[PDB]
């Protein structure tokens, strides 16, 4: 499963939490805090190659 | 299952919580808080490759 | 699984936490803190060659 | 697995932590602190030749 | 595995910690501290010939 604490996005910031996959991952994710300001981009988790492109 | 605490979206912000999949995931999700301001975009959960494209 | 503490991105900074792979890794990741300022770019985790290109 | 303490990037600095490989490494990584200022570039971990080029 | 203490890069300095190889090394690395100033370049670890060129 995946757990999210607090994510903050300010001014056109893009943040992604979790896993994007063709298959369903069997792993656990723990997230504390993220702060994004002034149009910043953040990735938390995992990305699959097939999903990526 | 999936649990949502509090998500805040201000000024044309787009936030998605959960899993978008061709199949139904058997995982649990826990979400605390999200704050999005000034048209920011956030993803919480998982995305399937087939669903993605 | 993967654990994230706190990541800070200021002013168009791009930070990626986790593993991007064609396959699902069976490893654990621990992250404390990251601070990125003035459009800086950071990578935390692992990258797969197939995913990379 | 890989463990990250604290990495600081100031003013367009690029820092990479972890291993970029065609294959998934079976090694553990420990990281304390990194400070990069004035557009400096740092590598922590390992790089695979296939991934490199 | 590889362990990193503290590496400092000031003013466009480039520092690399770890091993860049076509194959995955089975050795342990210990790093204390590195300070690079005024655009200095440092290498810590090992480099493979195939990876090098």
DSSP code string of A5-46: EEEEE-SS-EEEEEEEESS-----EEEEEEEE-SS-EEEEEE
Residue C49 per-residue DSSP state? H
Give dist(CA C12, CA C15) in Å, integer: 10
Give dist(CA C46, CA C21) in Å, integer: 8
Give dist(CA D16, CA C44) in Å, integer: 6
CB contact under 8 A, C18 and A42: no
Phi, psi of E28 (to 5 degrees): -105, 140
Asked if C12 reaches chain D (Cβ–Cβ under 8 Å), the answer is no
Q: How far is CA D26 from the centre of its chain?
A: 16
Task: Select from C41, C47, C46 the least CA-distant residue to C14.
Answer: C41
SS3 A49: helix
Instruction: Scan residues 33-52 of C and list those with Cβ closer than 8 Å to D.
Output: 33-50, 52
Strand partners, B9: B36
Give the E-state strand segments of chain D in sequence order: 2-9, 14-21, 29-37, 41-48
* Structural determination approach: NMR
**D2-9 vs C29-36, strand pairing mode:** parallel
């Amino acid at each position: 499963g995946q757990k999210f604490g607090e994510m903050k996005t300010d001014d056109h910031s893009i943040a992604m939490q979790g896993i994007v996959g063709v298959a369903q991952p069997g792993v656990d994710q723990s997230f504390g805090s993220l702060t994004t300001t002034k149009s910043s981009r953040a990735f938390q988790g995992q990305m699959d190659a097939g999903s990526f492109s």
